Each structure stands twice: as C-alpha cells, then as structure tokens.
Amino acid sequence: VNPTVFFDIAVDGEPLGRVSFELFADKVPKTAENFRALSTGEKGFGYKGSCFHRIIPGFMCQGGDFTRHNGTGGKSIYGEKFEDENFILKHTGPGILSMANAGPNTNGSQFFICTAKTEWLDGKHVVFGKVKEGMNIVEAMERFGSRNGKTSKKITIADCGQLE
Numbered sequence: 426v427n428p429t430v431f432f433d434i435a436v437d438g439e440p441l442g443r444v445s446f447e448l449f450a451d452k453v454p455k456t457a458e459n460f461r462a463l464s465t466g467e468k469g470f471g472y473k474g475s476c477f478h479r480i481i482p483g484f485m486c487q488g489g490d491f492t493r494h495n496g497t498g499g500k501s502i503y504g505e506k507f508e509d510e511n512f513i514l515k516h517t518g519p520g521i522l523s524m525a526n527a528g529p530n531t532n533g534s535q536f537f538i539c540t541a542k543t544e545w546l547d548g549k550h551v552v553f554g555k556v557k558e559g560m561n562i563v564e565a566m567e568r569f570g571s572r573n574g575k576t577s578k579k580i581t582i583a584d585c586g587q588l589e
Contacts, residue, residue, distance in 0.1 A: 429446065430465075436579070446460075476488065486537060501534055523550045523553065
C-alpha cells in the first residue's frame with residue numbers, strides 16, 4: 426500500500442540507470458504525498474528535468490530544487506513550505522530518503538538520499554522513504570560528487586513517476 430516512485434538518472438544527458446523509492450505513507454502521509462505528487466508531476470510541476478545540485482561522497486546526494494537548480498529554491502504541493510510532520514523514522518544507514526529544510530517547519534521540495542548512516546540528523550530532518558531498487562545507481566552518482574558538493578557532470582532526473 427506504500428507507493429513506489431522511480432527516478433531515471435542521466436549524467437550529462439547519457440542514461441545512467443533507475444532508482445526506485447518506497448515512500449512511508451503509512452507513517453508520514455503528508456510528507457510522502459508531497460514527494461509522490463512531485464514525482465508524477467500531476468499538480469503541474471515537479472521533479473522531472475531537475476538536477477542533483479549537491480553530492481558529497483560518503484554523506485549524501487541532495488536534489489529537488491526545481492525552480493533555481495542550486496539549493497535556494499523549490500516548493501511543496503502545500504505551498505512554499507510545510508511543517509515537520511513527525512520524527513518517527515531515523516537516519517539508519519545508506520538509502521534513507523529525508524527532507525532538506527532551513528530550520529523548523531520549512532520543508533519544501535528539496536530532499537537528500539543518504540549514502541551513510543547520519544544519526545546527527547535525527548529529530549531535525551523528516552525521514553520519509555528508502556531506496557528500494559538501484560542503490561548501485563546511487564553509488565554511481567556518488568562518484569560524480571566532491572568534498573564541497575559540486576558535481577563534475579550534470580546529474581539530472583530525466584524521467585520520474587509512480588510504479589506502484
């Protein structure tokens with residue numbers, strides 16, 4: 426009953442592979458529904474064509490800024506920012522999907538994919554999903570990041586949507 430969405434990832438326009446995510450709609454329904462709608466684009470805007478603007482190997486891949494493409498933009502289906510829903514789920518290891526924010530109750534559309542267990546983020550960023558298939562593709566994305574987060578090639582979401 427938990428939805429599954431996919432990202433087809435392209436590197437400088439060349440297809441890399443597909444990542445699918447389980448969204449924990451049972452535990453964080455309002456936040457999950459945000460990510461799901463933005464993945465299908467059914468509200469008229471969302472993630473298709475946007476880039477991963479910050480990739481730090483051994484830490485995380487950050488994306489979701491589809492209005493300014495650099496970490497300063499984005500917006501939710503609920504408006505420009507929505508509340509921290511809960512912190513039931515923790516940052517337990519690689520593959521965790523969590524919301525970026527700018528302080529309490531500032532969730533928009535930016536998210537990150539953890540590539541290591543980030544426990545210091547617990548209680549500060551809302552965890553709402555996990556990589557289901559294609560963790561190897563996230564590992565391949567990592568190799569295009571750097572210590573300061575700048576990517577050496579452009580990593581884009583060429584297509585996305587709902588599988589299940």
